[PDB]
Amino acid sequence: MLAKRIIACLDVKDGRVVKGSNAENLRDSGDPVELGKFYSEIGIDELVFLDITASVEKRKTMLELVEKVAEQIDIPFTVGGGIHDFETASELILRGADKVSINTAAVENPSLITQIAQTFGSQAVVVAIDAKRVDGEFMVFTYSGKKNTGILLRDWVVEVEKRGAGEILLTSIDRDGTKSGYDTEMIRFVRPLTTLPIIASGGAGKMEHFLEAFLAGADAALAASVFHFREIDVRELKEYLKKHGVNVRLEGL
């Protein structure tokens, strides 16, 4: 059966991971190399490096992060945050990013998905879909959740797979950071619409939330807060999930 993955989202500013959380077991929890390597060693399956500024000097600083991270970590990582075009995605993958996450640029140019997939393989292209329920209908939002595109989530999911994406990173904006649970209604809504792996994102607060995301059909669970704020232990989480039938990888724990 398909693997079920636990993925940590590391928010990045100026090539460093947003700090303020005290990893007194680490020398510098702002270092993407040291932090990513640590997560790799404690059982995280993949990383996402999300540039949350996505703007000034982002291009160069993210390239340097990729160069340093790729040579030191042994689990896959995705980069995202303001990847606007094929050349930017290409540079990141060529420097060692395993995957790139595109969102606004994909909505505005869906064949960008296909271009990356054809050059680098579909597995290198993650389409991040940020959605909200708008008057009872799931809609796609771009520009960090500030633009309702008026595109129905249902239609965009189908198009994204048609365009050759390898995975969908499905973020419920309205649960993100709330620690209130993943948007399992959204996950369940998307599940029958695509055969692609769905990375659920936004809302994780406790181990049981991960179980619910997987029961809703997620193939991976992404979380920022619970790892950033050191609220959940990765090994304890995987043991609990495996006990409840979820096909997580316990190797190396």
Numbering used by the authors: 1 to 253
Describing publication, verbatim:
We have studied this problem on the example of the mobile active site β1α1-loop (loop1) of the (βα)8-barrel enzyme HisF, which is the cyclase subunit of imidazole glycerol phosphate synthase. Prokaryotic ImGPS enzymes (including the ImGPS from T. maritima) form heterodimeric bienzyme complexes that consist of the cyclase HisF and the glutaminase HisH subunit, which supplies ammonia by glutamine hydrolysis. The active site of HisF is located at the C-terminal face of the central β-barrel, where two conserved aspartate residues, D11 and D130, catalyze the cyclase reaction. Based on the conformation of the loop that connects strand β1 with helix α1 (loop1), these structures can be separated into an open conformation, where loop1 is flipped toward the outer α-helical barrel ring, a detached conformation, where loop1 is not visible in the electron density and presumably flexible and a closed conformation, where loop1 closes over the active site.
In summary, our crystallography, proteolysis, NMR, and simulation data demonstrate that the HisF-G20P and HisF-F23A variants have opposing effects on the conformation of loop1. Whereas the G20P and F23A substitutions decrease the kcat of wt-HisF by several orders of magnitude, the F38A substitution has no effect on the steady-state catalytic parameters. Instead, the G20P and F23A substitutions likely influence turnover via alterations in the closed conformation of loop1. In contrast, in the case of loop1 variants HisF-F23A and HisF-G20P, kobs, increased linearly with increasing concentrations of PrFAR, which is indicative of a simple binding process without involvement of conformational changes.
